[PDB]
Short mmCIF file of C-alpha atoms and ligand atoms in Angstrom, two decimals:
data_model
loop_
_atom_site.label_atom_id
_atom_site.label_comp_id
_atom_site.label_asym_id
_atom_site.label_seq_id
_atom_site.Cartn_x
_atom_site.Cartn_y
_atom_site.Cartn_z
CA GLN A 1 0.00 0.00 0.00
CA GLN A 2 1.08 3.57 -0.97
CA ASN A 3 2.75 2.02 -4.05
CA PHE A 4 3.89 4.29 -6.87
CA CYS A 5 4.94 4.56 -10.52
CA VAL A 6 7.55 6.88 -12.00
CA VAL A 7 6.72 8.34 -15.42
CA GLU A 8 9.43 10.19 -17.33
CA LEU A 9 8.23 13.23 -19.25
CA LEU A 10 9.32 13.99 -22.81
CA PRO A 11 10.92 17.45 -23.19
CA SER A 12 8.45 17.80 -26.10
CA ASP A 13 5.50 17.39 -23.66
CA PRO A 14 3.53 20.51 -22.54
CA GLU A 15 3.65 19.12 -18.99
CA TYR A 16 7.47 19.02 -19.08
CA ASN A 17 7.52 22.57 -20.52
CA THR A 18 5.32 23.87 -17.72
CA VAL A 19 7.56 22.42 -15.00
CA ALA A 20 10.76 23.47 -16.82
CA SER A 21 9.59 27.10 -17.27
CA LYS A 22 9.06 27.58 -13.55
CA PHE A 23 12.37 25.89 -12.78
CA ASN A 24 14.25 28.05 -15.32
CA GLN A 25 12.84 31.24 -13.74
CA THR A 26 15.79 31.10 -11.34
CA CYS A 27 17.74 28.07 -12.62
CA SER A 28 18.17 28.55 -16.39
CA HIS A 29 21.94 28.20 -15.77
CA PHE A 30 21.47 24.55 -14.79
CA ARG A 31 21.04 21.78 -17.34
CA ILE A 32 18.03 19.47 -16.92
CA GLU A 33 18.70 15.72 -17.29
CA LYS A 34 15.05 14.68 -16.86
CA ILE A 35 11.69 15.37 -15.22
CA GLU A 36 9.47 12.59 -13.86
CA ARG A 37 5.91 12.59 -12.57
CA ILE A 38 5.52 10.59 -9.35
CA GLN A 39 2.20 8.68 -9.34
CA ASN A 40 1.29 7.57 -5.83
CA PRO A 41 -2.52 6.98 -5.65
CA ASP A 42 -2.72 6.53 -1.87
CA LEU A 43 -0.54 9.55 -1.15
CA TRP A 44 -2.54 11.64 -3.65
CA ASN A 45 -5.87 10.51 -2.17
CA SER A 46 -4.69 11.45 1.32
CA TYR A 47 -3.50 14.82 0.02
CA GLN A 48 -6.74 15.58 -1.85
CA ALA A 49 -8.73 14.51 1.21
CA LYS A 50 -6.85 17.07 3.33
CA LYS A 51 -7.32 19.67 0.56
CA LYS A 52 -11.08 19.11 0.43
CA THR A 53 -11.39 19.86 4.16
CA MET A 54 -8.97 22.76 3.88
CA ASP A 55 -10.90 24.40 1.02
CA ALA A 56 -14.11 24.07 3.05
CA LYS A 57 -12.37 25.82 5.95
CA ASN A 58 -10.18 28.66 4.64
CA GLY A 59 -12.85 30.43 2.53
CA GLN A 60 -11.57 32.61 -0.33
CA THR A 61 -8.01 31.37 0.27
CA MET A 62 -6.12 29.62 -2.49
CA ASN A 63 -4.75 26.87 -0.25
CA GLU A 64 -2.37 25.21 -2.67
CA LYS A 65 0.97 26.38 -3.97
CA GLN A 66 3.62 24.67 -6.11
CA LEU A 67 7.01 24.86 -4.40
CA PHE A 68 10.48 23.30 -4.62
CA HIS A 69 12.37 20.91 -2.34
CA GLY A 70 15.99 19.96 -2.98
CA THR A 71 17.17 16.61 -1.66
CA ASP A 72 19.96 14.04 -2.05
CA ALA A 73 19.57 11.15 -4.51
CA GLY A 74 19.38 8.71 -1.57
CA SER A 75 16.06 10.24 -0.49
CA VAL A 76 14.14 9.75 -3.74
CA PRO A 77 12.64 6.26 -3.06
CA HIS A 78 11.53 7.42 0.42
CA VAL A 79 9.80 10.60 -0.78
CA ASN A 80 8.16 8.72 -3.67
CA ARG A 81 6.38 6.30 -1.35
CA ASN A 82 6.05 8.25 1.90
CA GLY A 83 5.89 11.90 0.78
CA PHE A 84 7.39 14.30 3.33
CA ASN A 85 6.42 12.42 6.52
CA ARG A 86 7.97 12.11 10.00
CA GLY A 87 8.88 20.23 9.83
CA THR A 88 9.68 20.19 6.09
CA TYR A 89 10.89 23.30 4.21
CA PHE A 90 9.85 24.33 0.68
CA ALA A 91 11.09 27.17 -1.54
CA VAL A 92 9.14 29.57 -3.73
CA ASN A 93 12.07 29.90 -6.15
CA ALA A 94 13.96 26.88 -7.52
CA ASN A 95 17.46 28.34 -7.09
CA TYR A 96 17.09 28.25 -3.31
CA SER A 97 16.48 24.47 -3.38
CA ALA A 98 19.35 24.17 -5.87
CA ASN A 99 21.85 24.84 -3.06
CA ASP A 100 24.30 21.93 -2.72
CA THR A 101 23.44 21.42 0.97
CA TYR A 102 19.88 20.41 0.09
CA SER A 103 20.19 18.79 -3.33
CA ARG A 104 23.68 17.24 -3.11
CA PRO A 105 25.42 16.25 -6.37
CA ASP A 106 25.55 12.43 -6.62
CA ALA A 107 28.65 10.55 -7.90
CA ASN A 108 27.93 11.93 -11.42
CA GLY A 109 27.24 15.59 -10.53
CA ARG A 110 23.48 15.03 -10.70
CA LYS A 111 21.18 17.11 -8.49
CA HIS A 112 17.57 16.43 -7.43
CA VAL A 113 14.76 18.92 -6.75
CA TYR A 114 11.10 17.98 -6.30
CA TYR A 115 8.29 20.24 -7.54
CA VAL A 116 5.68 19.87 -4.83
CA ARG A 117 1.96 20.62 -4.44
CA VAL A 118 1.88 22.04 -0.90
CA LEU A 119 -1.18 23.03 1.14
CA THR A 120 0.07 26.37 2.46
CA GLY A 121 -3.41 27.60 3.46
CA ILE A 122 -3.27 30.32 6.07
CA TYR A 123 0.20 31.13 7.40
CA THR A 124 2.40 33.30 9.67
CA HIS A 125 6.02 34.20 10.65
CA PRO A 126 3.19 25.05 14.37
CA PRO A 127 1.51 28.11 16.10
CA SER A 128 -2.21 28.75 16.82
CA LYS A 129 -4.54 31.30 15.16
CA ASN A 130 -5.96 32.35 18.53
CA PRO A 131 -4.12 31.51 21.81
CA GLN A 132 -7.63 31.14 23.36
CA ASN A 133 -8.43 28.31 20.91
CA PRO A 134 -5.12 26.32 20.65
CA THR A 135 -6.66 23.37 18.74
CA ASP A 136 -7.10 25.32 15.46
CA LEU A 137 -3.55 26.13 14.32
CA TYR A 138 -1.96 27.84 11.30
CA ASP A 139 -1.54 25.68 8.19
CA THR A 140 2.11 26.50 7.51
CA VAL A 141 4.71 28.99 8.67
CA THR A 142 6.77 31.29 6.40
CA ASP A 143 9.78 33.61 6.64
CA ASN A 144 7.82 36.67 5.52
CA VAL A 145 4.03 36.93 5.19
CA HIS A 146 3.85 39.53 2.40
CA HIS A 147 7.00 38.59 0.47
CA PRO A 148 7.48 34.84 1.17
CA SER A 149 10.45 32.87 -0.12
CA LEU A 150 9.90 29.72 1.97
CA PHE A 151 7.08 27.73 3.62
CA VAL A 152 7.30 25.04 6.29
CA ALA A 153 4.69 22.25 6.52
CA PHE A 154 4.27 20.01 9.59
CA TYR A 155 1.28 17.69 9.18
CA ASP A 156 1.39 14.59 6.95
CA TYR A 157 -0.27 14.57 3.52
CA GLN A 158 0.10 18.36 3.34
CA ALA A 159 2.52 18.08 0.40
CA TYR A 160 2.43 15.91 -2.72
CA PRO A 161 5.74 15.34 -4.55
CA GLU A 162 4.35 15.59 -8.09
CA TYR A 163 7.52 15.96 -10.15
CA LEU A 164 11.18 15.09 -9.77
CA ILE A 165 13.74 17.24 -11.54
CA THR A 166 17.18 15.72 -12.17
CA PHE A 167 19.74 18.30 -13.34
CA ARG A 168 23.44 19.29 -13.41
CA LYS A 169 25.89 22.22 -13.60
C1 91J B 201 19.76 13.81 3.94
N1 91J B 201 19.07 15.10 3.82
C2 91J B 201 19.56 15.87 2.67
C3 91J B 201 18.99 17.29 2.72
C4 91J B 201 17.45 17.28 2.83
C5 91J B 201 16.99 18.68 3.22
N2 91J B 201 15.90 19.10 2.34
C6 91J B 201 15.68 20.44 2.12
N3 91J B 201 15.86 21.28 3.11
C7 91J B 201 15.66 22.61 2.95
S1 91J B 201 15.84 23.90 4.12
C8 91J B 201 15.38 25.12 2.96
C9 91J B 201 15.10 24.59 1.76
C10 91J B 201 15.26 23.13 1.73
C11 91J B 201 15.07 22.19 0.66
O1 91J B 201 14.73 22.55 -0.46
N4 91J B 201 15.30 20.87 0.89
C12 91J B 201 14.67 25.44 0.57
C13 91J B 201 14.26 26.84 1.03
C14 91J B 201 15.31 27.42 1.99
C15 91J B 201 15.30 26.61 3.30
C16 91J B 201 16.94 16.31 3.92
C17 91J B 201 17.61 14.93 3.78
#
């Protein structure tokens, strides 16, 4: 259970182009080896379930964002099956996740950054909305509320690792 499939995208595919564009906004100086869509039905269903309840709760809020997460090659099979379970940091701009401390170059100089659907929801600088009602907390935290560059999720199934980007210098 929570099994997955890994589908490589053709650079001639609109879906590859979409992911690449966003990546190249801050990382056009890197070369992309490949992009793969991670298909994990049970992780996706858990994520959508949490999104349904979140959309019913946060009103006019656009709860979802697409953010980056750099990681070592060793971590790929874990993320693919488990998502980002047991907080976890995500970047607005790809170049931040492209730092060698997050996405280490493997033996061949290859670097790995996920492009993640994250349920950011309502967020602040896992704290509570009202200290009088400490059961209803904030969805994520960020570094800056008006000009965010990073978000941190805590609860499971709050982030779906849709695409994997393999690239090099
Ligand atoms: C063995 N480990 C290798 C490292 C990996 C860390 N993953 C990761 N951490 C961070 S902290 C941070 C960002 C970020 C990220 O993208 N990935 C981006 C925005 C700025 C702040 C965990 C497993």
